[PDB]
């Protein structure tokens, strides 16, 4: 199938440069152009540029002097590079492919790369259990979760039992604390009678700090 | 650049109802407009190309119309899974531009929240901080009040709230309120309570525990 897979999320210092790799499969770069689109709080969706099959590049007007797109046909990789970043360049950056080689209707997107522009340092999170008890139990159903505290920057991924548990999972949006670090909780409801025989693990992954933690949550 | 104006920013409807999204262009663009769906934590999904042409794998309930400056994306029978943001894109003029987007919220029956409270772990207490979490699960509508009390003292300014996006399966919301204390302050007190207020409750619900 047609897939676009972008490199991991990361922090970029003000005035420094941004670098993202788009690795594609299911088609050849010699046949299709790869587009680049970002999504900021300020300007929403915004077309940045494209590299065509022949290697030609078009950059949107405001980015013609600080944006560089390259590629490697044999490795099926596209390279995105932007210079002199400011705080409002903080956005999700996508690579994309159109329906046809020449067009602009984007049917295939990369998963996105959340880029944060700040002068701060990367910090990995601490993971604490939200233990189930009688005060998280309701009608044979128990709630339990993981507190993912004090990390920077966004994002963290959370899954449960390596993806085998998805029903009743809520992972809350991160909030920014006064410390300047983010914090987040992920909860799931399960039958209370399963707490004795099932193991529940939240899989926490903070790519910017390369922090991977599996936290087992159990009644206390 | 072409300016695309989507109106309104927010649409709220009941399931099974028909709904229409608007996209107006600052000048004529013929039928050179594409529509996108973006679900929570997702990338944009192509729905309609060139005003009305259908896309593979897209349900038949999605259709579009319009020409010139006035365009419309329609859903004949809206489902719970349609909860998302919708964007229009023009490409009659370089560079291609997108609208600001329209949000699709769904109505449903009033549902009271299940309230659960979680004391801090001993693990966190070792670091000198105590987080107490209050969970409001699967409720509607979104509006709720959470009030914290430590030994009958009303807390204020020391809690933070987070609300999930609308659930695409049952149209509910969930909310977490976290009370953050120092370990010392936490240890100097006994009764911890979050009182919850919501339309679905005939009286406030208080979940509480005693430290120890």
């Amino acid at each position: 199938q047609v897939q676009l897979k972008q490199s991991g999320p990361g922090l970029v210092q003000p005035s420094q440069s941004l670098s993202i790799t788009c690795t594609v499969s299911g088609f050849s770069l010699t046949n299709y152009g790869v587009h680049w689109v970002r999504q900021s709080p300020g300007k929403g969706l915004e077309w940045l540029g494209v590299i065509w099959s022949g290697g030609n590049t078009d950059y949107n007007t405001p980015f013609t002097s600080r944006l560089s797109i390259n590629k490697d046909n044999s490795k099926s990789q596209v390279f995105f590079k932007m210079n002199s970043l400011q705080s409002n360049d903080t956005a999700i950056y996508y690579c994309a492919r159109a329906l046809t080689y020449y067009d602009y209707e984007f049917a295939y997107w990369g998963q996105g790369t959340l880029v944060t522009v700040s002068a701060a340092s990367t910090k990995g999170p601490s993971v604490f259990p939200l233990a189930p008890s009688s005060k998280s139990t309701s009608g044979g159903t128990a709630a339990l979760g993981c507190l993912v505290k004090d990390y920077f920057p966004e994002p963290v991924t959370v899954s449960w039992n390596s993806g085998a548990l998805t029903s009743g999972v809520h992972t809350f949006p991160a909030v920014l604390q006064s410390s300047g670090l983010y914090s987040l909780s992920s909860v799931v409801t399960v039958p209370s009678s399963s707490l004795g025989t099932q193991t529940y693990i939240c899989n926490v992954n903070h790519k910017p700090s390369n922090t991977k933690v599996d936290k087992r949550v159990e009644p206390k | 650049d072409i300016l695309l104006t989507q109106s309104p920013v927010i649409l709220s409807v009941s399931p099974g109802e028909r709904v229409s999204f608007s996209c107006r262009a600052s000048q004529s663009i013929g039928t050179n407009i594409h529509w996108y769906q973006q679900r929570t934590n997702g990338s944009p999904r192509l729905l309609i190309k060139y005003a009305s042409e259908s896309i593979s794998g897209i349900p038949s309930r999605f259709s579009g119309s319009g020409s010139g400056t006035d365009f419309t994306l329609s859903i004949n029978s809206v489902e719970s899974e349609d909860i998302a943001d919708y964007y229009c894109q023009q490409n009659n003029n370089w560079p291609t531009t997108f609208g600001a987007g329209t949000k699709l919220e769904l109505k449903r029956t009033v549902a009271a929240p299940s309230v659960f409270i979680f004391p801090p772990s001993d693990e966190q207490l070792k670091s000198g901080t105590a987080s107490v979490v209050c969970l409001l699960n699967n409720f509607y509508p979104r509006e709720a009040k959470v009030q914290w009390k430590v030994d009958n003292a009303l807390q204020s300014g020391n809690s933070q709230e987070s609300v999930t996006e609308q659930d695409s399966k049952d149209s509910t919301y969930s909310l977490s309120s976290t009370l953050t204390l120092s370990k010392a302050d936490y240890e100097k007190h006994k009764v911890y309570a979050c009182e919850v207020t919501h339309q679905g409750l005939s009286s406030p619900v208080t979940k509480s525990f005693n430290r120890g």
């Binding site: 999504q39 900021s40 709080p41 929403g44 903080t90 956005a91 999700i92 996105g112 959340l114 966004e154 994002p155 949006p173 991160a174 | 920013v9 973006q38 929570t40 934590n41 997702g42 943001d85 987007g101 949000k103 996006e165």
Partner: peptide, 10 residues
């Protein structure tokens, strides 16, 4: 306004 945490307008 677009939110980077959920990818949803708020």
């Amino acid at each position: 306004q677009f939110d980077l945490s959920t990818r949803r307008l708020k």
